[PDB]
Design a protein around this ligand. Structure first.
Ligand code: Y01
Ligand code: Y01
Ligand code: Y01
Ligand code: Y01
Ligand code: Y01
Ligand code: A1AIA
Lengths: 48, 87
């Protein structure tokens, strides 16, 4: 309702889309590093 | 039955359908690669590793086929045209 907080809230809602695209690119890089690290440092693992 | 076969052939030869089929095969190949690198392997490869090996070999055959069925006529020019796409 406030004249400054309201536009700030919908401004955050507009930047959620750019945040989602950053999340997608970070997700690709993050699982690539995570899978590589877990697969190197733990060779003998059961399905879990 | 002829219109049904015509619809199937027209659908499966669409570029968007081919792209999404290749993409959904890629996203089912990547999970199999993740499974074979996370879980331990025995002396011989498992079923999922054989599927991943088959995917790599058929993709390599596909890339040689893109080298052959290119625009130029002499092999070095075919390779030089193909190496512009860095991916
Ligand atoms: C305790 C932990 C789990 C933190 C919670 C994180 C999220 C559940 C919250 C934090 C900030 C929230 C956002 C803050 C601002 C907005 C704008 C607002 O949307 C509008 O005003 C509509 C117009 C527009 O989207 O621009 C409400 C949804 C949204 C995206 C919110 C959705 C839910 C979010 C992402
Ligand atoms: C690319 C970025 C923007 C998003 C990707 C990060 C999240 C999808 C990850 C990071 C931390 C993860 C969490 C880290 C730890 C846990 C606890 C885990 O619960 C247990 O292990 C049970 C308790 C125990 O055994 O100690 C369940 C999954 C969860 C919530 C994970 C769910 C997936 C999370 C939220
Ligand atoms: C393109 C990107 C998003 C792909 C990411 C895929 C992986 C994060 C997923 C896909 C296949 C998943 C695996 C599929 C099967 C299993 C077996 C499963 O084994 C059991 O639940 C135990 C079986 C039992 O004793 O009942 C444990 C999780 C795991 C390793 C999964 C771990 C997570 C994996 C590697
Ligand atoms: C089209 C795209 C979006 C999805 C297609 C991929 C999935 C359907 C595949 C990829 C990884 C597969 C999993 C990889 C590994 C396993 C472990 C496998 O378990 C074993 O090999 C030991 C136990 C048993 O023999 O059942 C059972 C199938 C499962 C869960 C697979 C189930 C089917 C999954 C999820
Ligand atoms: C074409 C690729 C790139 C994606 C398509 C996904 C599915 C067609 C594949 C992916 C994972 C596969 C599964 C991975 C492992 C197994 C366990 C396997 O279990 C056994 O053979 C048990 C007995 C034994 O251990 O020999 C049976 C086939 C199954 C379910 C596979 C069935 C076919 C699945 C679902
Ligand atoms: C290996 C990835 C891919 C592909 C898949 C979907 C979109 C783009 C590329 C393929 O699976 N075969 C043809 N060429 C390729 O590099």
């Amino acid at each position: 309702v406030n004249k400054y907080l309201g536009p700030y809230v919908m401004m955050i809602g507009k930047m959620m889309i750019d945040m989602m695209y950053f999340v997608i690119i970070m997700l690709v890089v993050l699982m690539s590093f995570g899978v590589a690290r877990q697969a190197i440092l733990f060779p003998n693992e059961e399905p879990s | 039955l002829i219109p049904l076969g015509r619809k199937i052939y027209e659908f499966y030869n669409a570029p968007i359908v081919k792209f999404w089929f290749y993409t959904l095969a890629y996203i089912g190949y990547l999970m199999l690669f993740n499974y074979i690198v996370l879980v331990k392997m025995e002396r011989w490869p498992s079923t999922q590793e054989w599927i991943v090996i088959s995917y790599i070999f058929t993709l390599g055959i596909e890339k040689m086929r893109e080298i052959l069925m290119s625009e130029p006529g002499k092999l070095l020019q075919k390779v030089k045209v193909w190496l512009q796409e860095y991916w």
